[PDB]
Amino acid sequence: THVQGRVYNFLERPTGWKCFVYHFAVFLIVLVCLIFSVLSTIEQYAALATGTLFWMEIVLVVFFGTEYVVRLWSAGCRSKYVGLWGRLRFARKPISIIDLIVVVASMVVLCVGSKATSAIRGIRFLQILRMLHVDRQGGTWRLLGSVVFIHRQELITTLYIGFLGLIFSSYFVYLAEKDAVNESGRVEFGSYADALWWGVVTVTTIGYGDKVPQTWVGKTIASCFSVFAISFFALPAGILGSGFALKVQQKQRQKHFNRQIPAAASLIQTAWRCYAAENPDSSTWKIYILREHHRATIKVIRRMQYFVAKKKFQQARKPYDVRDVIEQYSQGHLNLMVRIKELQRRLDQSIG
Amino acid sequence: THVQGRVYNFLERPTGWKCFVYHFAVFLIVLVCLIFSVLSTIEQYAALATGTLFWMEIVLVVFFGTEYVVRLWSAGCRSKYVGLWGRLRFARKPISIIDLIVVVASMVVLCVGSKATSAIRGIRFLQILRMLHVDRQGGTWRLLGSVVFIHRQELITTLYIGFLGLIFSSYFVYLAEKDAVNESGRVEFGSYADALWWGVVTVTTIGYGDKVPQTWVGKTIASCFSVFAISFFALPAGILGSGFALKVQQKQRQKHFNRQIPAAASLIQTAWRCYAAENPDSSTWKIYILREHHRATIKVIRRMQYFVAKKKFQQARKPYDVRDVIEQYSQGHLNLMVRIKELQRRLDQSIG
Amino acid sequence: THVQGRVYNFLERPTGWKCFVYHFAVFLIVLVCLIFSVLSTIEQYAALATGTLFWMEIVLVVFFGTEYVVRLWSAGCRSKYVGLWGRLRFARKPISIIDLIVVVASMVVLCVGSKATSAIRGIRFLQILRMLHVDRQGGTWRLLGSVVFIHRQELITTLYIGFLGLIFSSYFVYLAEKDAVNESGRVEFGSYADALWWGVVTVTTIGYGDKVPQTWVGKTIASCFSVFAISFFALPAGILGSGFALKVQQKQRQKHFNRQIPAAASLIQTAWRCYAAENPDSSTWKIYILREHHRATIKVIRRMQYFVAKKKFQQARKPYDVRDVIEQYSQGHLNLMVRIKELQRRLDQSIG
Amino acid sequence: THVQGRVYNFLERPTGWKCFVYHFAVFLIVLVCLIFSVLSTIEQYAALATGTLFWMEIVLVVFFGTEYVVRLWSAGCRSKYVGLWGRLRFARKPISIIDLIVVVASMVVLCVGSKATSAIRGIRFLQILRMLHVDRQGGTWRLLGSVVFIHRQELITTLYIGFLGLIFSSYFVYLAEKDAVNESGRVEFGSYADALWWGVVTVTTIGYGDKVPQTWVGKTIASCFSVFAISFFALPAGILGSGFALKVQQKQRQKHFNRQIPAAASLIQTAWRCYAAENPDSSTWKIYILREHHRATIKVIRRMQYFVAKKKFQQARKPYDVRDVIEQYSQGHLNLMVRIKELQRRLDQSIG
Amino acid sequence: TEEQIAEFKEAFSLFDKDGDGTITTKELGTVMRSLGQNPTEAELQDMINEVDADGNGTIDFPEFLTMMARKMKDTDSEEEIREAFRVFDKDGNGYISAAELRHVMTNLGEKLTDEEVDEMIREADIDGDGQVNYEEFVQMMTAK
Amino acid sequence: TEEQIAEFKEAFSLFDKDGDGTITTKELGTVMRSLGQNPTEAELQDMINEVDADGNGTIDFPEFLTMMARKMKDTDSEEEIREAFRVFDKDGNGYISAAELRHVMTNLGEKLTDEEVDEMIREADIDGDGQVNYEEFVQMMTAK
Amino acid sequence: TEEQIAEFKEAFSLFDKDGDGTITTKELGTVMRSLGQNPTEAELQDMINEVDADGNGTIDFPEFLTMMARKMKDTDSEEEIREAFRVFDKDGNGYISAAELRHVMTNLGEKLTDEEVDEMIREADIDGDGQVNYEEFVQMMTAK
Amino acid sequence: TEEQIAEFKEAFSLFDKDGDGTITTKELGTVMRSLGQNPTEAELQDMINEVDADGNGTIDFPEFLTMMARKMKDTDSEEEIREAFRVFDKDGNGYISAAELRHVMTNLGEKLTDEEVDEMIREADIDGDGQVNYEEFVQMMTAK
Ligand SMILES: [Ca+2]
Ligand SMILES: [Ca+2]
Ligand SMILES: [Ca+2]
Ligand SMILES: [Ca+2]
Ligand SMILES: [Ca+2]
Ligand SMILES: [Ca+2]
Ligand SMILES: [Ca+2]
Ligand SMILES: [Ca+2]
User: Fold this and answer.
1) Which CATH superfamily is E75-141 part of?
2) In chain H, what are the domain boundaries?
3) Nearest ligand, CA of residue F34?
4) Domain containing C190: what range?
5) All chains having 3 or more CB pairs closer than 8 angstroms to chain H
6) Positions modified as Phosphothreonine (chains E, F, G, H)?
């Protein structure tokens, strides 16, 4: 009854300790195979590793093929992945396309080889590409995309400033060191191509030194460039670190999952009622209780209820802030004004 | 009727997808021309690119001249840019001055060339200078200026500490390595000029190595300098990254644009009333309703209304904070104290 | 009466100025001995330091042995460290195990030597390992572990991105520079092992230069790699610096220690009452005042009181936030609604 | 009448535009003299600058002597600097001591020279030391000291981790590369002194390359060290940048200067009353109105008023937070409970 | 369309019933209590804060046109409705039972009548399997 | 100027009408209701919080001089008034219509009388084109 | 266990005494005041906010089963109880006196009767030394 | 000292006048109104929140000893008093006038009587120069 869900949880979304350790073991053995293949080219393991490359290759491709097949079969648990169309939708995902491409390339290269260096390198490429499959919740790619999307104008501005600064600095370096000759007669700055290479080396602080200015004015302008533009080079690390820190800080102010249940239920009910407003022969009109022209009024009431439910839904997804306190105080003050006014009116009536 | 506004939106402020992709295509083709001109000096494209430099140069200068002309003509849509004086005000802008200087230099160099290396380099300079025209909302220069203005004393303090630290460190390096001779007999630290160059290389972590101390005391003082002053070198990146992060964090707590409309309207009305207080023969004095010396009182009332409207305007531009909650609670508590006191007085009168 | 507590405070947890300066002197003399042993191998102090190594070694091992013995004897002050089992629990701590291993290795090497280079190096290793004993509150290791635990998914994501980026960049570097030969005929990139070494040098910005690409495409891909992946290399410093800054910022919003005393006392009382609910013959049942089936009801009441006390305890450990204001306003509004309703009912009864 | 205050403002605390530009001109001319003296040693200005060194030296020492004399004379405006004792207190300040030492050293060296390289270097040292006099509000040194004081345990922990990590990494590097020989036969790692130098170069990312491991295990351990400990090297920049950012963020939530005036006045009054409680023959005892043993009660009342004023003073210096809202709501709720109880009692009495 | 504008015009006139050109919370509460909807100031403020885009606290004709310029078939609309179905999906495996839906409808919201509960269990049912195909349900909510 | 100080002196005396030397919200409300301005504690606190710079909650003579030392022609003043005209400029293209200005004046604020609405449409009009030259309007607000 | 479920069933029925299937603050206050526990709305909200996990504001049968699925012997439970004993440990040296415990019990909480104060001083006492072995006390709280 | 402890003992007994061993806001207000100090709940909470260090809301004997263990001559005390004199020093040049001090004393706080205003102007005066030597004033506040 739940075998498909159980295998889907075991494969796609490991959790706890059993499946977590199993996936960790798979990842570490994959990394061990990758590093052994890296060391294979060196003469220490030139022969044995290459001789054993085919065995591990076929074993791994069989394992990943079976894993892909069982995952695709278990994809039917998801409602959107039910039927042939749902299986195609699951396969059309970028990760599924990557996996199928990797396995088909692996089987092609293995069958061609059975009966060179580029093929082995492509094997490593497909292994490290399939290695990306461990990303299941999108916690790397989707998270970085969201972070970029939040700060698009900021990164655009910072990159713009950085490129303009480095371009002007490289032009100044070239004009200062057109005839730059280092010790023992080499033209280090043969052109502004060399100037640009020195500038990018300086901003990245590599300091290779193949193109170093030999004039005092060149040293001063290089120092000014290092002061100005290297900060641009160091920006994104601190920027996204601060972003992660503030996200974690705001991670402590979310409402409990049961608080949004009433809002979700109310919005579902209002959406259904708005949809059913198109059904004149419904029997739910008299529940509120003769009615000829009030259908438009009922439609408007349902529409405004749906809008209020939408507002509640947007409020549910956002954390606590000053707005909630403001609206709570406003509603309480309005209630107590209304009650005091009612009491005043009743007392004025009573006193006579 | 709206053709001037439409062309102004198309040129100055592209948005959506059509104009956005058009401007992106213009920017990318400009960058492609720039990189091809960069590669022109190398022998791979020494002849063909140089032969085709004039054609692309004249085409581009014609395109930017027409663009500048149409933008200046469409500038009349803005109220401050109406008439000859308004056109001059538009032209007096730094960006307009930059564009006109670039186009006039381009046409001058093209007409002189038609009937050398420095001219071509100036062509690249004006192309990359006109490239700055894509900045329209000031999101780079105005934003960096504002960020600096906010933290002027902080950057002043940090730079002061950094320069003093590097100066003392360089002096210590020189006094430790006055007779610094590296392997195979070269005086790496010929002077404290060499010491300063080594210090700036160390603080920028270039590590060229042309002037490296050869004594243990020199190594220790260099390590202390690297520990102390390189943090100064790395400051501004993290500082402005944190600034951007906090700005984005505060970007979520702005009131809706319709909330400041009443404050703006009220302040406009109060400003007009204060201005019209100088008109004794106005007919708006009796709207509040015989009046000889009350004109000064009405002027004071209008002035205090204008001050209250100014306070509302300053409150509108700032985000939510504890002050709004404090004042809301204070006004509610005062209202309910007043109402309870009125009820107590009325009940005491009634009981007798 | 308090001699054990006094010596425990003097040894384990120095504070004030006397013990603080004593521990600082011990730490600085330990560091001085370590640096003198470091300088011992150099010919400046090759003979005298080595001759005096045994004396300082035996003096130090005696001092640390006596210190460990007295600390273990004074460990009986702690309730969990009372008796032989408590002494074993104190000894089973990682720090105690480290200390006993260090002292036993020291006495073994000293007795073997009394009647080489590796032994001396192991002596330095045990000295620097015992140097870690100054960590008493766990402020280094426990703090870093907690910081990692808070941001486990973030560091996992960032490291994943960094390794994948560097791997692809190194592969691109190798494919671009398979035949990389530098000046005067050396194959700098003999393999993708060399490519990986150059990539890690670039991402760490060492810039040794033993393997530098000599092609324009290689320079461009290296620049792209430096732009992309070096930010990953610089992440953790800024990440944990921001974490420390936000922790210090939140350090100002803790309630006074006396505020959690009532919650702690209430939860202790509720826990004892829940435990004693299993004792039918208790005499505390009639304090609330015949009772046959109400024991289950009393157990449920005690259980819900214990749950409320647990909620109060979790509230005590967390700093101030919007939730406290929300619940305070809710309780006040409910109280005043209830009071106004009671007043309305009484007045309606009175008016008749 | 105010000439002393005017000259004190002109000298010690320039503000506005006149004195600000004057001080900026003084600072820039001092920097110009410093850079010209720096360039003096180079043969470009070896003769002219040295010949003109004495003239600028005597002019500057006369200017700073007159400035110090007039500042000391004008120090009498401050109440704490009134009289000979106050002048000594002004002179005992570190900045005043620095200035007097600089001027006395300058006059000594000038009178000795009138009737070598070290003397000139000491002249530069005293010029750059007097250059620190521009710090008047302590915005550099006091600010950095306060920032350190806030985060003492954090910097202690981070430095502890960094030194331990680099020490273990250097030991691993030495044990891996005891016999490290680079190309063409040089022992780069002659000892763990060389290993420590390579480690500090790597953590500072200098990359001089004089001591680079030649083994794969050495490269791997160096990569691990770069991953772990360089973040420690980059910490303080981001840490204090985040500190400055949060300080500027909190700079927007201070109460107006007039809000703390009532608290200051109340605390001054309570302090005086507590002091005057020791004066039995005062005539202020009967203002509150026979009184023999009530003097102790009045002393206790004055003491508790002083404590309340102290609480108000501590509240004034701290910015807005949740505590103010909590206490305001508590006092309002208590007031309205009290009023409702009074109304209920009066109505119950009236109904009969 | 012009016909849509006219429809909004008579809808505004009917919902006003005053002729002032602006409709207030008092009038909205009056018409609801005439229908028998026992209104609340909470409902009144939940109405003011979002529809009244001008911010004057009333319901003007241009305002009403602006809020009737809405559209319920927006990509954001089906995205948020899909997330809402994901909100109460406790399992997270794409399986949703009709029993919990019935319990939620009956015990929360407007306390759905048995008639509309039967409507729920009959419209959202793939041959009464108990596992509703909520993606097509979202599609035919959006399709209207 | 000394004459300006004297003018402020008799203005303070007239606005006091008590001789205590300090003027309170009670007296300000009394004089407004004598004029017929139906005051509110909200207006009273909006007065106290900004003018009363000393912070004692009253209106003293030196305080009144400090608030009369103001100036409405400040660079910040025309900058903020220009931004205020930019606040309701929905198009953002520098085009402002008189119809929206009339609607805002009539339906918000003091509910401008038709007389002052006509004053608006006649003073701010470049030959009645409907596109007011708001920069010169700002200039002649500041010029007073 | 099934017997545990049945026990919870009759406990829910007895605590309801209404047969509606949901138990409210009114009924809980009624039963407490029948016992004589002088309830308070503060106690009522302290009950609603934590046990009522569904969020409907009442006490349903599945809710009651969910809150009875608790366990007091959790590692978090003894950790928090140990920290609680650490809360009032002013010395911080692992020494706790019985006099302060007696004073706290008598002057705070439910104002412990002398009988239960004697129970405290007799159960938590290593031969009446005054230094209670609070670790074994925590263990035998958790052991129950 | 033991004599100081005894003095605190009879001070606590006199301020209690009830014999319960704990003193409450009701008793403190009663004794003040017997003296004629027209107390306020604001004063009562300003008393509870700081002196009552235990947190029980009353005034116990050990609590009273803890708050009498205070000392007014603390380095923090003269530092904060010096900053307080710096708070109203508008000029910031170390010059303080007696006129502003007199105005503040008369118009703020307890509304100092002319007798204590004369006491201020006579104690804090270097031969009546109007520029008080506030550093020695701080010293002889701390010296008591
Ligand atoms: Ca109409
Ligand atoms: Ca009505
Ligand atoms: Ca007067
Ligand atoms: Ca009045
Ligand atoms: Ca039942
Ligand atoms: Ca009841
Ligand atoms: Ca007593
Ligand atoms: Ca009383």
Assistant:
1) EF-hand (1.10.238.10)
2) 1-74, 75-141
3) 4
4) 150-250
5) C, D
6) 40, 106
